[PDB]
Design a protein that fits this description.
Two copies of one chain form a homodimer. By secondary structure, chain A is α+β, with helices and mostly antiparallel strands. Chain A has one domain. Chain A is 18% helix and 20% strand. In chain A, the strands form two sheets. In chain A, strands 5, 6, 7, 8, 9 and 10 form a six-stranded antiparallel β-sheet that branches. In chain A, strand 8 and strand 9 form a beta hairpin. Chain A is globular, with a radius of gyration of 21 Å. At the A-B interface, helix 2, strand 4, helix 5 and strand 8 of A face helix 2, strand 4, helix 5 and strand 7 of B. The structure holds protoporphyrin IX containing FE (2 copies). One protoporphyrin IX containing FE binds next to strand 5, helix 6, strand 8 and helix 7 of chain B. It is classed as oxidoreductase. The entry lists the keywords Dye type peroxidase, dose series, heme, oxidoreductase. It forms a dimeric assembly.
Chain lengths: 362, 361
């Protein structure tokens, strides 16, 4: 229930241990006033400082003037900080505004069309995003709700996504969670202690060619529907062939323990782990940080399940794109479909109580 | 860490309220009474396993490679997490299997209420399973696997995820707050009150339907909140809507949350005043609902609210009179009922040989 420090060279919510709950919101900007938008950014940062510490935003949830609405909507009163992190990102469409065209980073690449893509334009894109992660879903909702409220008239929510449970790990010393297909997800990720690997693969460096992004990262978000009816009638051998790990232990095929190193030649040629592995992609490596979701039924008598996939990388062109291209022949494609997509530039961290979100850009 | 599955009553009604909810309504697709009884028996065996934290059937792995696993596996390595599984039968079940004359009179259809805007697709249902647990993945895995075992005899009509408190960070006799920011549950029937449970919650044999003795009747209402509207109301408006202050949750004019309300100091259309048993001829409810937030609708608005669950000894003397009295509730300005269902929740599974529905079939 402890707090995660909000200030740093990097934003929390990336290398941070993965919290149990996600509330992800993408916003469109509805003001042309660059000065108004900057004011919003400073205001949102002040609220984030309170929220991540478990304090009410503004002057609190009650005790103000009786005839004025409370500053804080109040549903997180009495709750601990619950490891809340708030991570902000800027979509490519934002750089068409406030005369920011020349500042859009090369590494913020538009994604090409991928085979099987069936993207819903209304749950894709967005001028910016806020990733709220916490162990308590009420805490995450309260944060998004109160940010949107403060931004009323300058931003609106385009689409949002709640994840009821993580399917990723930045802490290999703790139990690896399972996704809704029943497999451990997160074994060979990048850990928050591997500061060398984070520099090489996650944080944008100054020499990369966009100085304001130094210390930031780039985020790919993909909403992926799972065909659980199809999956649930496949044999155990089929399911394990698709991945290249056994279902029970999550060990690479042929080996005994989850964390034994995969021997790719023993896997089927179209096995997910074989195709995604850095060694098959010129060393391309990703920080995976996704969550499971279910949004009711599909109206055809079945549950509707999926995975909200999130990846952080130093350069979308050298991270997500090569690996996703290599999955064109993935055996997993038979059981999933990508139905939403968006990319963001995640700026550097808020360095101290004088700094603010996006200060290096504006 | 676990809640016993067997008893005179089903668990998940008087037992401690768990942090998360996965509620699913099912429609029945078979006409064959025997095939349905067989499914009820299979479901009971699976529920025994799930509530103890074990996989269904012969497990999630280690079986014959050319066979699909009995259990879909996403709860491997998790704990029982206080999972309870509570089944109920909707009025429409009784049009099948020759059961028409066994429908309890207390399982009454709900009137249309002023301001209802009920989504047909998220209403009704031949039966329900309420899955409560401290880990949402444990609850989802239970619904996912019962549906799979039932495939071909039942389909999922609608499903709802909900959250209450998070018990790892929140003390347990701290009242949870709803998404309007007000404490919710202060004056409620507690699981410790055996006498009030008998008076108000459990069906008795003299009520008229012997096979329902020890069961209860369930009303589910999906209630959307107009969040953005609520959040623009003054603090005084919000407190006047309920008749309690927002910070402490004390009845107006009182000092503490648990001070008994003085109804005459509340506005005549305040929610607590209209819902209180003294304003409804003594009618008293066991509320056991959960908040929901499903995302955002087409207008950028927050799709969130209260998934209201009330258990009672007779719908006609429980939910119906109280809800009728809310016709003029000041709260109506900020909420809308958009889904509804009622269910007869049978008596408990007595022992290892018993099964869900045995007293009816
Ligand atoms: C529903 C969609 C997906 C599911 C169920 C899934 C499942 C898995 C599983 C079970 C593993 C093995 C354990 C681990 O090392 O984490 C894995 C590994 C991995 N996945 Fe996926 N995955 C999905 C989508 C994706 C996508 C879209 C990408 C990249 C575009 C990706 C990239 C990777 C990578 C890089 C690894 C680590 C391979 C290694 O280095 O050993 N996955 N995935
Ligand atoms: C979004 C919908 C609703 C919200 C936010 C809400 C909220 C509240 C709040 C804050 C209280 C006072 C604290 C407490 O004793 O629990 C309360 C009391 C109560 N409510 Fe509601 N309520 C809702 C719907 C309903 C409905 C539909 C019913 C019945 C049909 C109902 C019946 C009651 C009862 C019986 C009490 C106890 C009053 C007393 O005995 O002091 N509520 N509710």
């Amino acid at each position: 229930g402890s707090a995660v420090p909000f200030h740093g060279a990097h934003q929390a919510g990336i290398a941070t241990p993965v919290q149990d709950r996600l509330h992800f919101a993408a916003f469109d900007v509805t003001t042309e006033d660059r000065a108004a938008f900057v004011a919003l950014l400073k205001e949102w940062t002040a609220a984030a400082r309170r929220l991540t510490a478990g304090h009410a935003v503004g002057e609190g949830a009650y005790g103000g003037l009786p005839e004025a609405p409370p500053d804080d909507t109040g549903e997180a009163l009495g709750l601990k900080p619950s490891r809340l992190t708030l991570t902000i990102g800027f979509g490519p469409s934002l750089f068409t505004r406030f005369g920011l065209a020349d500042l859009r980073p090369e590494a913020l690449a538009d994604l090409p069309k991928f085979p099987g893509d069936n993207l819903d334009r209304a749950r894709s894109g967005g001028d910016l995003c806020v990733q709220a992660c916490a162990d308590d879903p009420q805490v995450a909702v309260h944060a998004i709700r109160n940010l949107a409220r403060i931004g009323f008239g300058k931003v609106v929510v385009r689409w949002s996504q709640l994840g009821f449970g993580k399917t990723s790990s930045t802490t290999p010393d703790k139990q690896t969670p399972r996704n809704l297909l029943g497999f451990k997800d997160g074994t060979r990720n990048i850990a928050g202690t591997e500061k060398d690997r984070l520099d090489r693969f996650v944080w944008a460096a100054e020499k990369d060619g966009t100085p304001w992004m130094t210390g930031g990262s780039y985020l790919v978000a993909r909403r992926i529907r799972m065909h659980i009816e199809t999956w649930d009638r496949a044999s155990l051998q089929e399911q394990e062939d698709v991945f290249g790990r056994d279902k029970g232990e999550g060990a690479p095929v042929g080996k005994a323990k989850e964390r034994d190193e995969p021997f790719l030649k023993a896997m089927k040629p179209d096995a997910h782990v074989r195709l995604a592995h850095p060694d098959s992609n010129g060393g391309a490596t990703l920080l995976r940080r996704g969550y499971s979701f279910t949004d009711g039924t599909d109206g055809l008598g079945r549950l509707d399940a999926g995975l909200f996939f999130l990846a952080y990388q130093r350069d979308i062109r050298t991270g997500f794109v090569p690996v996703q291209r290599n999955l064109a022949t993935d055996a997993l494609n038979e059981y999933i479909q990508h139905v939403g997509s968006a990319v963001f530039a995640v700026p550097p961290g808020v360095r101290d109580a004088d700094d603010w979100w996006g200060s290096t850009l504006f």
